[PDB]
Design a protein around this ligand. Structure first.
Ligand code: 83Q
Length: 477
């Protein structure tokens, strides 16, 4: 449902809402206004409201007194199946729906300039403030307007059932479409796309979102509820301690499956996923016990470029074990043998030239290049995207320069926040690098990658950093 999230309520607004429209076991989650980036889980117990903080600095949602998760949905899912969270107290604000917005004539052109059969949107009435309008497109070539009146806190389209919110109303006429007198069926097949822009417009769009970014991002967040794909392998007993974060797991359907492993019972698991929009494996920072597994992956998938986006230690916290030999040194990691051939240090990153081979057979050698980005801020995102961009641009040419190279391995700590910011920037400039004659749809791209790994861009700050990055790249054409 994900409608248990309320984008714009204060604490007290939530408390009274739980205590007036809810029962013991009712809960909700809301953006925290004390700390931008944080969120708050609000639950009713014994007729009282306890509030639970959840911090997300860019790596994961850290529920205090609980566990760390990829999305708030997987969080709620996790706790609704094991202070009890029984009944979602659902939100009626539509600000975070894909279809909500806006003048009629302006609505008609967009539907004409960008819509197909079934594209629709809901806007606020201009004739009677308080009422709403549902504008829908039908064709093979017509746009239809359906007024939605607000009466005594309930909404309708002039007859039939009265709804407690537009989302309910809309959801009802998606499954039960209005039929006009001459046969025309007003099918609400897809919300109108207003986020895909031409690459040359990014600068215009970024300026108007800065007076916007919040709304669009959380409108993308609200859609994570569609991405609760199974992650069972990662919960299997033999795999629990192969995860750096027990509750941040790879989708079974996109995980990398290690083959040709030791006869041990389970030898095919690693907290990684293939990311296909050049392809990527998105993974977590190695642990002591999965280093040999990490290199089995690199070998198997023919990866020749690794991109690590964290220090080994950050703020005294460990984030990734040292899985590469010292410069000029040679190490054996299970059946895999790695020599660090040379290291080169730039200001923002280090390149390690690593040769990977399988012990015993000197016909499996391949160079692997590890690009170790070292200047990401301990919290937040870089104030400027130049460093990231030149990094990725270097990374891309290295990858393009090797024949038959496999996925490009990308990893941070939990492998969702930073790792996902990078891959996405990389996909988008991949497009712009086609030139400036191309459309860019950041939300779409983020959602396509979250469908392949949980939580793949973590924060709003990062989300805007992606826009800044693409803008900057376009400026430098
Ligand atoms: C005004 C608005 C209020 N709610 C409504 C429209 N805007 C909007 C719409 N859709 C999404 S999401 C998405 C986008 C493309 C492809 C896919 Cl697949 C997804 Cl899932 C988004 N982030 N913003 C911005 C805010």
């Amino acid at each position: 449902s994900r409608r248990w999230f309320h984008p714009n309520i204060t604490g007290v607004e939530a408390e009274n809402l739980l205590l007036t429209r809810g029962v013991d076991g009712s809960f909700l989650a809301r953006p925290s206004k004390s700390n931008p980036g944080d969120f708050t889980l609000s639950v009713r117990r014994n007729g009282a409201v306890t509030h639970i903080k959840i911090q997300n600095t860019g790596d994961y949602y850290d529920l205090y007194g609980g566990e760390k998760f990829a999305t708030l949905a997987e969080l709620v899912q996790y706790y609704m199946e094991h202070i009890e969270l029984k009944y979602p107290l659902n939100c009626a604000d539509p600000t975070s729906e894909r279809w909500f917005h806006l003048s009629g004539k302006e609505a008609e052109k967009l539907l004409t300039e960008k819509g197909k059969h079934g594209s629709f949107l809901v806007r606020e009435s201009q004739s009677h403030p308080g009422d709403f309008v549902l504008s829908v497109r039908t064709g093979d070539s017509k746009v239809t307007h359906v007024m939605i009146r607000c009466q005594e806190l309930k909404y309708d389209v002039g007859g039939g059932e009265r709804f407690d919110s537009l989302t309910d109303l809309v959801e009802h006429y998606k499954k039960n479409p209005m039929v006009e007198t001459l046969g025309t069926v007003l099918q609400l097949k897809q919300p109108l796309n207003t986020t895909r822009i031409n690459a040359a417009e990014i600068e215009s769009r970024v300026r108007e979102l800065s007076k916007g970014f919040w709304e669009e991002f959380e409108t993308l967040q609200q859609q994570e509820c569609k991405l609760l794909y199974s992650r069972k392998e990662g919960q299997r007993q033999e795999n629990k301690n192969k995860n750096r974060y027990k509750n941040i797991l790879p989708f079974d359907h996109t995980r990398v499956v290690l083959h040709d492993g030791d006869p041990e019972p389970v030898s095919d698991y690693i907290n990684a996923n293939i990311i296909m929009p050049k392809s990527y494996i998105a993974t977590q920072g190695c642990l002591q016990n999965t280093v040999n597994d990490f290199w089995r992956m690199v070998f198997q998938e023919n990866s020749r470029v690794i991109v690590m986006t964290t220090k080994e230690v950050e703020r005294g916290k460990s984030k990734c074990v040292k899985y590469w030999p010292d410069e000029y040194a040679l190490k054996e990691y299970g059946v895999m043998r790695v020599r660090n051939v040379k290291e080169s240090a730039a200001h923002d990153y280090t390149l390690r030239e690593l040769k990977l081979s399988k012990v015993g057979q000197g016909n499996t050698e391949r160079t692997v290049w590890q690009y170790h980005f070292r200047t990401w801020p301990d919290h937040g995102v870089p104030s400027d995207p130049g460093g990231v961009l030149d990094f990725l641009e270097e990374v891309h040419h290295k990858q393009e320069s090797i024949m038959d190279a496999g996925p490009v391995v990308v990893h941070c700590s939990a492998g969702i926040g930073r790792t996902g910011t990078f891959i996405v920037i990389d996909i988008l400039i991949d497009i712009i690098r086609k030139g400036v004659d191309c459309d860019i749809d950041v939300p779409k791209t983020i959602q396509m990658v979250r469908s392949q790994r949980s939580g793949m861009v973590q924060t709003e700050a990062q989300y805007r950093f992606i826009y800044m990055a693409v803008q900057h790249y376009i400026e430098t054409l």
